[PDB]
Amino acid sequence: MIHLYDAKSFAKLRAAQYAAFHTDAPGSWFDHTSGVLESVEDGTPVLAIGVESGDAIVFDKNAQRIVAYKEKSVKAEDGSVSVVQVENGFMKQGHRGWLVDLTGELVGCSPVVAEFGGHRYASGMVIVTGKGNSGKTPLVHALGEALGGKDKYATVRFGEPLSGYNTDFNVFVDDIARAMLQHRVIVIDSLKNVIISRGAFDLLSDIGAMAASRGCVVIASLNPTSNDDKIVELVKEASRSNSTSLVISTDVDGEWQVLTRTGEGLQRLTHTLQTSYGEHSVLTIHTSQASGKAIQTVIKNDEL
Amino acid sequence: MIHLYDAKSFAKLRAAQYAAFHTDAPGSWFDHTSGVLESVEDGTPVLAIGVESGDAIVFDKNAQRIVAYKEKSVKAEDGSVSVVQVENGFMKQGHRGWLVDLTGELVGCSPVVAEFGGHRYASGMVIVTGKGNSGKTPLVHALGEALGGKDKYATVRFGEPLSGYNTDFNVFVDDIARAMLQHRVIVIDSLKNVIISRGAFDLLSDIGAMAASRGCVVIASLNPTSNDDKIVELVKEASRSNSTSLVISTDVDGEWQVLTRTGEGLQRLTHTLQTSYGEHSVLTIHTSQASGKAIQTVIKNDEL
Amino acid sequence: MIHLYDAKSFAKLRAAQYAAFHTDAPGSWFDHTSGVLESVEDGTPVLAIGVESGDAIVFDKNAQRIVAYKEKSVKAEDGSVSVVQVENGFMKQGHRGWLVDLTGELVGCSPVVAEFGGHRYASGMVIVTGKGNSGKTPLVHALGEALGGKDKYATVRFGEPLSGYNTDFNVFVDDIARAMLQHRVIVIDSLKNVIISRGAFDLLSDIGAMAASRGCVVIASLNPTSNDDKIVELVKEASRSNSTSLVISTDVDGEWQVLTRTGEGLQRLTHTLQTSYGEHSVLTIHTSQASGKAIQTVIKNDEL
Amino acid sequence: MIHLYDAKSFAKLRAAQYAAFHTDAPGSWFDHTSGVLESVEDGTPVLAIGVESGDAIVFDKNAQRIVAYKEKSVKAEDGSVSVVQVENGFMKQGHRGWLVDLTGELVGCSPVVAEFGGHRYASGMVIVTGKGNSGKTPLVHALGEALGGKDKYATVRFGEPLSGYNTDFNVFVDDIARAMLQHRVIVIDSLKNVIISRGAFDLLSDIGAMAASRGCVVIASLNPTSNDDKIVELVKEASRSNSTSLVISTDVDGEWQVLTRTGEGLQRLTHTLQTSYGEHSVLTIHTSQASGKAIQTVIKNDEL
């Protein structure tokens, strides 16, 4: 919905967003939204995500797909009215994204999802990319395990010529939806076949906000393989604007750079990670500051 | 509608447009249009805006979406006839934009929306853009607060991978319509995912006139990230022709240039703004001339 | 329809086309077609113009839109048959343009619409463009007033982020049709949003011929802003081939050059105008030869 | 249909094609097909041409449009079967082009349409083009009158911002069809708006064969105005492959070069024309050899 502000209420919001990343307990936002979700009347639509065609499928709090749901309206304090309807397994009325308010007045945040090795990581979408010899898949799994901490991370596999890999987009968004509804740390191995159908474009622009609102983190590998400048710019835009955080490889093998967005219009943070391989290619992240647009852009041209 | 002129009535029109920006009390046009809107019969369609498909959703004077409205025709002074009809929540007959006359013979104006720091600001659409390190988001919010003055400003959030951000275009236009019907100062944070569906193209060409007719101001951040010459020219065209005013960053951090259109075919005004950050990135605009097309173009190439 | 000719009937035609521009009384063609129109049976469709989709809306002699009209055919001398039918407000049978013959055997002319400052001006479509500091809007209004002479000119406003400006294409062509049905001097302030839907392409291809047939003149500002070669070439094409006359700015502020097509197969004329500003930006045109395609192409490259 | 040949029957065909251009009486083929057309049962479809959409309208021998025609089949000696059906003014079964055999075994000819100034001219389509100052419209009309000889030529006007000019493609193909059915010499002023809908593409590839089969000549002006390499190649392809003859301007004003195709796979002929203007821009062609592909290509790059 829309929000109204004066100098004072804006200063307050800025303070709360700052706290959502820097001082709240890591993973607390996820626990809070998990509660809001379990307070939902059973069978009520809580999330809608676009399929290949541009249509959306809808799920309930138990990650069950709702095939039918008679029209229902809800007027928010905003004055606006939200209407949801599901016919034959597809949304007839409503919108993509969360169909229940998980944030209230706490919007534009980057809820800390976890702390590891002395650094706080943001919820939302993290794109792992870069050129060079550092492997993306091993890094995505090591980050998944690290941010998970005491919790197991969820792995969504898509579009790789390996055994058991799903290659159907519609199954992919269904896997993604279920993961976000049930797990704080999510790994997506291969955004590649996504980088185009209306569904893929929707996913690219919707997932980061979906995750940030839930307080969960989605870690997706994006190999900028092609040298075709039209998708190169797409990968770069995804890395710059549809991602809450960016993890990109450097000149030095095994070393990565993390760029974190801490809130709407706030400064981006940056830090470096060292990594190494153990048996069967299992990678470990070793544990042993603000950046301006100038810096941001320099990192981005690495994609060229 | 169309208007007829001879030298004398054209001169009177030019004098009136001049006063609409330079001498009318700031924000008085907004108060005037609020009265016109309130004098509308309850349930009568006053505003139509396009959704993603290119279809239009319609609202009444109370920012409530009209789903059913029997065909009704009105013949204007012009002799032309306006016909409106709404079926199943969508405009069957009519046009995008204001469905009631908010202007009469006072057309082609840039109704002054507010005065701040000794400068008059126009209603209509303001695009905040530019390259460099000066942040756009902090600026749109500071400008929203400053032009709001005694009034709170409305914030429409769209397409950012942050908590509570809507990413569905159809919800976005619903938020925009309601904001313009109820508030004089609006902030749109992120025109990014707009820069393409028919709905997005409609918004870009419709919003400035909608707002200028209402006497409200829509301050939209537009980060010219991509270097893909096709959207680059789209961003530049938007900044040059679809905006009533332009606020662009300079070589010096914290400093901005404001290019204001004062009326149809009138000269543009320019002035500079100095700004600084305080706690939690809250930005403040400090407060302590005509330009030609050549100057205009020079600023525009900053976009490259 | 088609016309048959031999050396003699061809010479007569060229003599008559020459007269239509060079010796006929200014604005006499418009008075004549006004006569043809008014002598039409009430309700008879007289003009069809394309809407956005490519469909056409139809008007009667009083600029009223015909929503229903039973199929009716007419056989001309040509032997050809014209069939017109209107269903649910849209043309089911017929063609875009004038539905009644306003020309007969007198075709291929640029009927003189007015004489001002010692120069004869042609009816049809005039595109006012060019790069530089010379203002397009002040110029079209000044031309409208001057060619209007004793008569007021009609102003059609479209696609500008200013008050009261319509931005819906379908309302635009309805405005245009009515203006041509009722006035000899018409100004369109902004073909910009036209420069693409089938309706827009249709308008660019139809308007010039429509106006010339009626003996009215349509003066349209076309700011060649974008540097995107695809539309830049569209602006040139429109300026070169869809315009009966071209008024383009020069290196000297306030100075313009006029290129006039005087008839089918005839030479273009050229003359220069000096102008100056008075109060509130009201512009005045001061009063106080054939060209070859070489000259014409040179002017055209000013668009680059 | 298909044709079978052995060395002897092929040599015979080659001899007949040679005679169709070089020795038959000018215009005799037209008279022959005129007879074949008048021997057609009244109301039977003889010609089908594509409209904008890609559908085709059909005419009878009197250039009357057939709106209904119950399915009918005809087996040619080829063994093949030709079926024609017209429903609601549109061909339901059949093909574009002549629906009655006008040629028999005499195919691949370039029937001499006329002789003038010591040169034989071919039927089919002639495209008049080129850069420079020589005017296309005056030349098309002078050629029309010259080839007409004792007969008047038919003029089809399309897409020019002049009085009485039709701008609707569907009316244009109807004018073209009628002209080919009733006249040996046809002039089309402006193929411009054709150079894209399926109808325009069809016309470009169909007209030359339509005319060549009838023994009529279609003279169309094609101004290679745009510098957009995609249509430049289109104009060049039209001039090279969809035209039976090409008339192109040279470095010297008033001088033209004619390139004539004399038959399928035969050598092209070339000659030069001198011209001059009389009163009201009436142009006269003064009256007082084989070329290879090398030569052909050189002429074609003139279009660049």
Place this chain on the structure above:
Amino acid sequence: MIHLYDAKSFAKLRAAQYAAFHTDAPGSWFDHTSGVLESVEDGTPVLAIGVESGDAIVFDKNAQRIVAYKEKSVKAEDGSVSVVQVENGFMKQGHRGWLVDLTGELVGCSPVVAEFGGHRYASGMVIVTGKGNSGKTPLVHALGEALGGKDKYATVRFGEPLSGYNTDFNVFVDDIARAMLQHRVIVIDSLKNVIISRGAFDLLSDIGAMAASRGCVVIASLNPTSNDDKIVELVKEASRSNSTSLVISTDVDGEWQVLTRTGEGLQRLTHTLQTSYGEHSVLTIHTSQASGKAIQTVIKNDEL
């Protein structure tokens, strides 16, 4: 269908493919397939070819178009099932290409179609192309006569602005289907208007296999006129991969190079042809080795 192999059956297949070109009696495969076709039940669909839309028309063994055919299924040795159905003149079920097995286990061959001047020529599609002064049309006809030998060759004429030339794609495929069903040597004069609808793309990828399976040869002229790199690469791909053989012009007038594919994955053969003109441009081919991919590519760039 699919075929299984071990070293031994693969060796036998390679030996059989070798003999299909090098040792079988010229044109014997065509005689063989004629017998297979004649043994088909009357009315049974034997061949389907695509029309412009991408739909397919179907024929019986007597080159008669089938408009109605009740669904019928046949299970091949492969285990697969072929189902055919024809409704309202169009294939409802089935596939493009031969609907009956003309090959059995003899697949991947280039059945020798004829021997002339001491050289064996393959069935399938032959594209005649190249730049320079050597004429394509005279060559396809001379080759049609030479490979026909004791038999007349079939000529399918398409898309040339000459008398009796069909320009409708749907008639073109009907002519092609019938020719291949009834004649061993076919000449297609003009693949030009093909080089795009789904039907045209289908023809390019289907014709070579259709003909090679029948044992017939289709000699198509392809004039690489345009310099538009996109169709240039299309012409080159057609010449390289969609043709069983390629006949291309050299630097010397009248001299051609013949590149023949002898089987799947086998080596290509090359030989040179000298030619000369006689009366009325009738060309005669005078009669008085393996190449590598490098040579292959060299010839191909001649197309640039």
Place this chain on the structure above:
Amino acid sequence: MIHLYDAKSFAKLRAAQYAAFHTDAPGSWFDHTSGVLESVEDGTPVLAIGVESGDAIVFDKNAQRIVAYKEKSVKAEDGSVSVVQVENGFMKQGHRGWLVDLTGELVGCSPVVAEFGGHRYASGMVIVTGKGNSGKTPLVHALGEALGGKDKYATVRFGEPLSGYNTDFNVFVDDIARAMLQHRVIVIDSLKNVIISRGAFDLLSDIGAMAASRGCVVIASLNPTSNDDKIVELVKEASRSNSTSLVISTDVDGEWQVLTRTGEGLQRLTHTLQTSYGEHSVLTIHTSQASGKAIQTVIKNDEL
């Protein structure tokens, strides 16, 4: 489905994926999945593959196409639900790929399909490409025979102008499905006509995963002929990301290099092959290390 992991379950998975390629008995995965398939209830849909339009056809365990199958759902451990329904021969509900779980928790593997000449080869999709004089076709057949070992390999022929070659995409995917359902070693001779319809894009994205899941290998020749950068990049992408293994030619005729993906997140292996020709072009592979992305990219540019 999705899988949850912590450090320990992840290490086990990587150990198992390593084993699937490095130590499991060659071809044992295929025997295992053959077991899963045969234990499926007759009639149960087991595999869905896309046809040209983007729709999917479905097969049972016996490679028979299912035309009708009433909606049936199944809930996996994942909690997710799989729903399959087939109407009129097409999948109404379900997804492309395997409709029955062939992998369970064992995902992301490249199951060893065979061992030949001291090298283990992976199941999944192998693309055989490269520039130069080394023949693709002889190589795929030689690999098919070698990896076949004691078993015959299945050959799927598509898009070549030779006898018996199918050129219809829908028959192609039916051939492919049947081959994977019934054979461990499969060769596709020509993905060329695939490199675009939704079906083609689907195939390129699905086949590798399908084959790897089954434990079968699909060897496809892909001749990178065109120099059109758009498809050149499509060939690289397919070679880089849609292939489980890549076999590409070198500077030395007869010599190839093999790049094998050994598992999800694992390193690629590389080895070189020498080959030679025997009778009738039958090729023999002679029998007698990890790579980094740098190495991999260098190989890829050989495509340019």
